[PDB]
């Protein structure tokens, strides 16, 4: 049954590998948050960054548990796809928001100098360009995510666009 899905999820594996161990560990999540905070040209060991990293940590827990390995174990490529698949398909709605909520949230906190808890087009663009996206890409991705066409991207509409690269990538998830 696998065809185009393999390619998309396959690269995502080799696309990360912080240390290049051939697996996914928790320490890989910690560097991520840090590696990101820097992209916004700000602190490192501050609170906003510590918060995000703090959230990213618990995210691994779900993997070790669902995968059945350990908080200090590792997941293979074939494992990622199998477990990832269920995450996108299986799993409860509140399940993705529960474990990922604090992960995506931490990012919104740094991506808001007004403290409103929402992602405005001016905020979204700032992040897309931060990861290596063009100014024209943000404007396009923004409208695609605004499910309610209200002009504001809330945490809800955030995850939706985020996890949706399986079939015909639209936003390209977090990585970019
Ligand atoms: Ca790794
Ligand atoms: Ca805001
Ligand atoms: Ca919207």
Domain ranges of the chain: 1-176
Angle at 162 (CA atoms; ends 18, 84), nearest 5 degrees: 60
Can you say which residues are annotated as belonging to the binding site for Ca(2+)? Answer: 17, 19, 21, 28, 112, 114, 116, 118, 123, 146, 148, 150, 152, 157
CA distance 107 to 14: 23
C-alpha of residue 27 to centroid of ligand 1, in Å: 8
Angle at 79 (CA atoms; ends 7, 65), nearest 5 degrees: 140
CA atoms within 13 A on the CB side of 30: 5
Q: Solved how?
A: NMR
**Closest ligand to 122 CA?**
2
CATH of 1-176, one of 3.30.2270.10, 3.20.20.70, 3.30.365.10, 1.10.238.10: 1.10.238.10
Neighbours of 28 (CB within 10 A): 17
């Amino acid at each position: 049954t696998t065809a185009i899905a393999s390619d998309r999820l396959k690269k995502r594996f080799d696309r990360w590998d912080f240390d290049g161990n051939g697996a996914l560990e928790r320490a890989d999540f910690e560097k991520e948050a840090q590696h990101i905070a820097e992209a916004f040209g700000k602190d490192a060991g501050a609170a906003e960054v510590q918060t995000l990293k703090n959230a990213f940590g618990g995210l691994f827990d779900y993997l070790a548990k669902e995968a059945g390995v350990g908080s200090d174990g590792s997941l293979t490529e074939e494992q990622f796809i199998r477990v990832t698949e269920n995450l996108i398909f299986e799993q409860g709605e509140a399940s993705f928001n529960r474990v990922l909520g604090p992960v995506v949230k931490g990012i919104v906190g740094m991506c808001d100098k007004n403290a409103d808890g929402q992602i405005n087009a001016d905020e979204f663009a700032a992040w897309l360009t931060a990861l290596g996206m063009s100014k024209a890409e943000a404007a396009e991705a923004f409208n695609q995510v605004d499910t309610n066409g209200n002009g504001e991207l809330s945490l809800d509409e955030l995850l939706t666009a985020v996890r949706d690269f399986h079939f015909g990538r639209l936003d390209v998830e977090l990585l970019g």
